[PDB]
Subunit: 278 residues, 2 copies
């Protein structure tokens, strides 16, 4: 591994390249992006050594390790092109926020080269300009092996993520989507809706946006995330997202009934759930 290729040189792609370099990688870091400015900026910042917007020129880089960091919706089309360009011994992995069937689709396109991944490290910022060289430190990184996953490549990807500080753990592609549908997608949905609530509950008399405190702002900081990306995530993992919103509403409606009936003792018990050493 001496030629790494960053596909999609934005916040995540750039953060991975910076982290890899800072961890001591001495090989070449190349970039591929459809946006010319992305490539230019990354080269200026020293995030990548060289880049291009022409997929065909990538063969000139002879990549042995590819990190898919563009929007998930672009993976399949990009993977098909890489299948003709990349040597069979190369390794291709990703940072996509969703896994599920995507993983099997990429395996069918790329064969043994593919290893699905998702670093649990977020941001509300976009673009390579905001890239960080320690973004993954202490953050979990979910790799999603399947029966067909290549043992050696999985081990390699794990080591690379550990080299940048990730806390690697494995989940099937399906389990990943369920888990994060509840622990990440649902919370984001709740944050978006909480902000939307203040829009509708404000009156020509009072503008609720004038009174948000810390509890409110902390809970809604993720509502500043990229709209296009979350529109994508919500649709890409819609089955689990629908189930998670439904489950949440079941819990909220239970709290609601406790409040309406003024069930003092049970209400306290419900609220005490927020304790637990876990």
């Amino acid at each position: 591994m001496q030629n790494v290729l960053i596909v999609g040189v934005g916040f995540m792609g750039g953060s991975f390249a910076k982290s890899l370099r800072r961890s001591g990688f001495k090989g070449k870091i190349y970039g591929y992006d459809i946006n010319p400015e992305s490539i230019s900026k990354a080269v200026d910042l020293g995030i990548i050594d060289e880049g291009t917007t022409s997929i065909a020129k990538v063969e000139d880089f002879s990549p042995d390790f590819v990190m898919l960091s563009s929007p998930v919706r672009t993976f399949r089309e990009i993977a098909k092109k890489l299948s003709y360009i990349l040597s069979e011994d190369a390794t291709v992995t990703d940072q996509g926020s969703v896994k599920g069937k995507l993983v099997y689709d990429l395996e069918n396109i790329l064969g043994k080269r593919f290893v699905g991944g998702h670093p649990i490290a977020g941001t509300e910022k976009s673009g390579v300009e905001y890239s960080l060289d320690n973004l993954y430190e202490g953050k979990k990184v979910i790799l999603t092996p399947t029966k067909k996953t290549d043992k050696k490549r999985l081990k390699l990807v794990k080591r690379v993520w550990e080299d940048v500080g990730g806390v690697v753990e494995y989940m099937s592609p399906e389990l990943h989507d369920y888990v994060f549908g509840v622990v990440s997608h649902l919370p984001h949905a709740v944050a978006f809706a909480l902000v939307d609530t203040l829009i509708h509950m404000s009156t020509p008399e009072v503008d609720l946006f004038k009174y948000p405190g810390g509890g409110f702002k902390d809970f809604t900081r993720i509502a500043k995330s990229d709209p296009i990306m979350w529109r994508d995530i919500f649709l890409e993992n819609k089955e689990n997202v629908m189930k998670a919103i439904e489950g949440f509403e079941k819990s909220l409606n239970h709290l609601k009934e406790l409040i309406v009936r003024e069930a003092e003792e049970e209400l306290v018990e419900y609220l005490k759930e927020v304790k637990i050493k876990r």
Copy 2:
């Protein structure tokens, strides 16, 4: 003003007391609390000059300025006792998180002496041992005067808060509970529900609490008892807020169910802009 009585010598009661001294107060600061330890520690810490665990004893302090800093549930019971202990020349104000009906009930019991208040500060900490002498510096303070409110007492209480760095503004008792019912209570109710959700959506193959980096960390250190009281005291507004919230969340859910790709991005874009302007 010269005989200050802190009712409920905890984090808030203690903070007001300390904020009082730093501001240059040279008079006497007394305390009343049902807990012996609260008084003893407060005295050693130089928080208060002297205190008692017997409400009757208060007359020995002949307080002319009282700051209710105990649980809101205790206000009505304490006020009734104070009505025949305090002289008609005394001023009584509070720190309760809720106003609304509480303000009118306190006025009916204490008369022209009562002035409702709510400092928007305090990191939820509990115990006079955590009180600070700057907790209000720059923070907002909501006073809820009514038609029966005494202009002289209102101005007094206002100046005092400002003397401890507070930024005062006025709201009717009902508007206060509506606003905070949506911007504070609802957000907390939502978090309690999220916790219940992770508990019930966890399965034998996964403990959802092990993954807080996906946005769940935003959502605690709260007090189950305090919130049980707040949810009871502000039941109507909290119920309306939850219903308002579910309308926003269901609108979002629907955009996902039918995959309205463009409308979803617009929904998220608007919320992002609104959250940024906060």
